């Protein structure tokens with residue numbers, strides 16, 4: 001019923017979603033070329049390789065459902081976003097119930113996880129993977145932001161609290177060679193907003209590197 005529990009995915013997700021190639025090699029006990037074969041077969045939509053001496057950042061094409069009022073059939077995951085970010089009160093309150101599933105390993109999600117080679121991961125491992133992969137988990141992007149070096153139509157009378165970043169870049173589909181909108185998630189103001197939303201700079205760095213990878217398509 002479940003798919004195969006993937007050694008490489010398992011190890012990366014247990015180690016925070018990124019490891020150096022040298023670390024992974026030590027864990028898997030293979031010659032470098034044998035590991036590269038495994039990584040290349042899964043492809044860049046699952047394992048991002050970069051120079052950091054190289055590292056591997058785990059990702060997935062699995063995404064959380066974006067429908068307002070979903071009914072079957074659906075090919076996406078159904079779960080509580082805020083919960084995976086440690087930001088859902090219902091994880092503490094006994095008053096009423098969250099409308100979103102707080103169990104990523106639900107019957108409903110089972111087949112989707114299998115379709116994406118994610119069987120045999122626990123909720124902590126899945127959350128690590130998803131939060132650095134699905135743009136759904138990012139803070140809102142400012143639609144008033146048109147690009148760098150422009151008098152912004154936002155920010156008055158009160159400061160803008162939305163990210164001044166390219167939304168398409170975060171979704172892996174910015175088609176500009178020289179985009180006018182920032183692709184720099186590691187900017188200090190961005191990191192503050194990410195942090196408040198529940199994303200640490202280390203998580204954002206992984207997101208940055210995954211998005212850089214997709215932009216280089």
Ligand SMILES: [Zn+2]
Nearest residue numbers: 065067070074
């Ligand atoms: Zn759905």
Ligand SMILES: [Zn+2]
Nearest residue numbers: 080083088098
């Ligand atoms: Zn919830």
Ligand SMILES: [Zn+2]
Nearest residue numbers: 142144154160
């Ligand atoms: Zn703004």
Ligand SMILES: [Zn+2]
Nearest residue numbers: 166169174179
């Ligand atoms: Zn862009």
